[PDB]
Amino acid sequence: GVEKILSALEIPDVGNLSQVVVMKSKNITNKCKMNLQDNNGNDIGFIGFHQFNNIAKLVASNWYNRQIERSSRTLGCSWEFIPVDDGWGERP
Amino acid sequence: ILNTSDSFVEEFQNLGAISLINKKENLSMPIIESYEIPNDMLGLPLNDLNEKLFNIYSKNTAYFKKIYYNFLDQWWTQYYSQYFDLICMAKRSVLAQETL
């Protein structure tokens, strides 16, 4: 399947699995994209989600690579990183 | 519409957008609830008065937002309806000329 389900692995257990992430800044510049790549420089696809039964799993999909930038279909692989800030300051 | 002149564009510029429609005045002023403050707070102390005045203040702000939404709904129902009528009629005119 083109949809590769992402997983959280032990750091000493990654081995030769696909882990190299290329970051992208799209316009502030809040919109962030993450294209996954194996250790051979090939594209695994952008990191978004896909529906498997009830659960929408985090997935590297090359279908995003087939979509033009800024298209609505690219809003699934667009992410927002939120650090703890003293201006927001709710309980972590 | 505004075709009585030799140029519609300058007439629109002069007379504003409101001149495009036929029913200019349709707004009805909503009735308010007359403002009253409860009488049990006359003898309240300082600290225990302030934070309930806070609640009443937020109430008044919410009431203001509600009145604004009433005006917005009036605009959409009474005014923008005629402009969407104009949109559809102009599109039909475009289609007729294209057919010609």
């Binding site: 389900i5 992402l6 997983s7 959280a8 692995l9 032990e10 257990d13 970051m23 800044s25 919109k31 962030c32 978004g48 989600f49 659960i55 929408a56 799993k57 985090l58 809003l75 699934g76 667009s78 992410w79 927002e80 990183f81 939120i82 650090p83 703890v84 709710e90 309980r91 | 806070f54 609640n55 937020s58």
Partner: protein, 48 residues
């Protein structure tokens, strides 16, 4: 955006979902779980 900094995640297609991990390991997966919930102080703020 900085290295070595912890960031909670938001997905722009479904802002009301947050990233959660079902199980750790190759046999596990990570998915978007909702709702986020609401944090509030009355008459001041009520946010996700």
């Amino acid at each position: 955006l900085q290295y070595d900094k912890p960031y909670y995640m938001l997905n722009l297609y479904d802002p009301n979902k947050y990233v959660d991990v079902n199980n750790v390991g190759i046999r596990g997966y990570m998915y978007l779980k909702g709702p986020r919930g609401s944090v509030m102080t009355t008459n001041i703020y009520l946010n996700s």
